[PDB]
C-alpha cells in the first residue's frame, strides 16, 4: 500500500546543468534522490523513491555550446587581479519546469503533509537552481496497481526517466541504440584522509567518479509500470528504479 505526494509544474531556473564531466543537461536521478533525502532530513518525512519528469527544460546556450557563467572574484588573495575578468570554470546553467512525485509514508492528515512539502520546496533548490514557482502539491495513494497508474497519470504532462541499462559502455550504445546517458550513482576511488576542508568532519568521505546508466525519456502515461520511473537509493552507492530496466 503506497502513498505519494506530487508537486506539479516546478519551474526552476539556474539549474546546474553540469550533471558530470561528460553529461550536461537534465539533472540525473542522483540529484532528485538527494532532494528526496534532503526532505527526509529537514521535514522528517522519510522518502523511499522519487519519480521526476521534465515538463520544460532548456540548457542555456546554443545547440552545440552552453552559455558559460560570468564568474565573480570570490577567492581570497587574488586582489589586484579583481579588476580584470574572473576566469571561467565550466558550469553550464539551465532552466527547467519539472513534475516531482515522492513516495512517502505518512500517518497524519494530507494537509500537514502538503504544508510540510510546501515548506521544504519553498526552501529547496532543484539541482542548484532556485525554484521559481510550483503548484500546490497534492497527495494521491496507490492502493492497487490501477491506483498506482492513477498516481502515474496525475503527473501529466511530464517526461519521466526510465532506466534502460548498460550493454557495453556509454558512448557505444548512445550512438547505436540512441538513448540518453545520466548519472545513476558514483564509484568510490579512494578514502579521503583530510576532513578539515569538508562539510562534516565525522561523515566519511570518498573521492568518486560518476557511474552512468543509459536512460530513455517516455511520457508518464506511456510508461506501463510506474515502478520503472520511481528512482531510489540502491545499495551499491548508486540509484536505481523500483521496476528495474525498462523494456
Amino acid at each position: 500500500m503506497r502513498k505519494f505526494i506530487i508537486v506539479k509544474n516546478v519551474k526552476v531556473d539556474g539549474i546546474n546543468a553540469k550533471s558530470s564531466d561528460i553529461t550536461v543537461g537534465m539533472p540525473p536521478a542522483t540529484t532528485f534522490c538527494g532532494l528526496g533525502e534532503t526532505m527526509s532530513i529537514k521535514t522528517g518525512i522519510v522518502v523511499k523513491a522519487v519519480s521526476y519528469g521534465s515538463v520544460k527544460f532548456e540548457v542555456r546556450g546554443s545547440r552545440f555550446n552552453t552559455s558559460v557563467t560570468k564568474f565573480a572574484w570570490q577567492d581570497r588573495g587574488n586582489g589586484g587581479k579583481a579588476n580584470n575578468n574572473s576566469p571561467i570554470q565550466p558550469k553550464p546553467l539551465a532552466d527547467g519546469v519539472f513534475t516531482l512525485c515522492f513516495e512517502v509514508e505518512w500517518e497524519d492528515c494530507a494537509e500537514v503533509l502538503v504544508d510540510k512539502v510546501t515548506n521544504f520546496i519553498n526552501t529547496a533548490r532543484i539541482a542548484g537552481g532556485t525554484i521559481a514557482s510550483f503548484n500546490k502539491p497534492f497527495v494521491k495513494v496507490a492502493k492497487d496497481a490501477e491506483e498506482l497508474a492513477s498516481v502515474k497519470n496525475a503527473m501529466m504532462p511530464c517526461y519521466v526517466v526510465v532506466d534502460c541499462g548498460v550493454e557495453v559502455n556509454i558512448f557505444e550504445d548512445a550512438v547505436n541504440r540512441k538513448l540518453q546517458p545520466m548519472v545513476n550513482g558514483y564509484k568510490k576511488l579512494e578514502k579521503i584522509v583530510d576532513n578539515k576542508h569538508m562539510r562534516d568532519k565525522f561523515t566519511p568521505a570518498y573521492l568518486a567518479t560518476p557511474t552512468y546508466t543509459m536512460i530513455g525519456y517516455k511520457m508518464v502515461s506511456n510508461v506501463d509500470n510506474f515502478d520503472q520511473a520511481l528512482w531510489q537509493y540502491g545499495e551499491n552507492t548508486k540509484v536505481k528504479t523500483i521496476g528495474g530496466i525498462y523494456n
Partner: protein, 302 residues
Amino acid sequence: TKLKAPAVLAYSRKINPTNALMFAVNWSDRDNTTAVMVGTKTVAGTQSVRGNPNDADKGNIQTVNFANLPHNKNTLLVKYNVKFVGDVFKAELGGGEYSNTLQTALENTDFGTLAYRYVYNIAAGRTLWRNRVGAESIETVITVNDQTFTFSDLLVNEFDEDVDVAEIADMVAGVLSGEGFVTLKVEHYMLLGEGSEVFPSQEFVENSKLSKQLFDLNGQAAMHDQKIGNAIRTIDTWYEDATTPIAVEPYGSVVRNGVAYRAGNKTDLFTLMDGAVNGKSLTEEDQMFVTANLIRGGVFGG
C-alpha cells in the same frame, strides 16, 4: 589570537531571484500579457575594429537575436520573483569556529538599510538596465503575502526615503536577520513605446550561427536570474571615493568596467571579515558590506 579563515569557507545565496520573463502589455490593458518573442535578424554593417582600417571598406554581416515590442503594445512587462532567505550566517562548508565568531560580530548589522537597498533595487527598476532608459513611465508592482504595492518614480542612483519600500524592508530585514523566507512577486510595467526594442539577457556562449544570442525561455525573451541577483545587491555605496552603487562583490569588483574599487585598499570582504572575527572594531558600513556578501554568498579560497 589570530583566528584564521577556513580554506574553502562558503555561504549560500540568500537573495534568490527568478528569470525575468518579458511580456508585452499596454499601459491601458496591463493584463494583456504577450510573450515578447526572441526574433532572429541578419545585419549588414561596416566592420570597424580598432585595428581594421584595411578592412573598413568591406562590409560585415552578422546574424543577431533581437527582441522588440510588437507594434500594438507600448509597454514592456517584466516578471520575476525574489526570494529572500534567512540563515545568512550559516556557512555550509566553513567550520563552526570562524563562521560562528563571524556571525556573533554581525548581529549589530543594521539589516534595515540592507533590506531597504535590496527592495529599492527591486522597486526602482535596477534590474532593467538598458530598457529603463527611454521609458516614459516605469511602474513596479510588488506582491508579498497577499498584499500589493505600486511605485511610479524612484530614482535608481540614490536611495531616497519612502515609507513603502521601507515597509517591505521591515519584513525583508526580519527574514534576513532572522529565519524563514519571504517572496516578492515583481511586476515591471515600463512604458517604452510602440515597437520599442527591449533588452533581455545576452548569453556568454560560443555561437557560430548567432553573433549575438539572447536568452529565451520557450522563445520568450527572458533575463538571467543571476543578472537580477547582481541588480538587487547593487547597494555598495560605501567603498573608497564612492559615487555610484556597485554590486556587492568580495573585492568590490566590476569586471564590466575593469575596475575593482575595494581591492588593495584594505576594504575588501576578506580583510573586513578577518577584522570582524579577530575582534577589530568594524565600522557600521563595513559591517553591512560583509553581511551583504554573506547574503550574496560565495566560496572563499584561502
